[PDB]
Amino acid sequence: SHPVPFSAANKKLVTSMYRQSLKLARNWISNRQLFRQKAVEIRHKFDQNAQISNPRLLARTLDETRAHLYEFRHPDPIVPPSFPGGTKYERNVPPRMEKIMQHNLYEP
C-alpha cells in the first residue's frame, strides 16, 4: 500500500486516532487531572511521530496505534443521553403530522 505521510487521507486517519485515544482516556479515567495528564502524554507521543517520512515505518506505527486502541477499548463508553447510544435517544419522538388516508368507501 501507499500511506502518503503528508496527505489528506493521513490527516483524517491520524486525527481520528487522536480523537479515539482522547475519548478512551476520558472514559477510562475518572479523575480530571489524570485525564489531562494522559491527554498531554498522548499528544507528546503523536508529536514525536509527526515527523516520519518513510511510508513503511509509518504503516507499522499506524498498525501499532490501531492495536493500542483495540487493546484499551472501553466497554461502557460515555455518550450524551440524546445521542444514538444514549439513555434519552428515541424517548418521546414528535409524530409526523400526516393526514388520514382512506381505505374504504364506506368505513370512516
Binding site: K11, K12, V14, T15, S16, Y18, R19, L22, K23, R43, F46, A50, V79, P80, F83
Partner: peptide, 22 residues
C-alpha cells in the same frame, strides 16, 4: 496544528454536550 483542531472539537463536544463524528 493538525491536532489542535481536534482538541478544539473535543472541547466543543465537552462544552455543549455533543458527539461530533469524523
Amino acid at each position: 496544528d493538525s491536532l489542535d483542531v481536534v482538541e478544539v472539537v473535543m472541547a466543543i463536544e465537552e462544552e455543549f454536550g455533543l458527539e461530533i463524528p469524523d
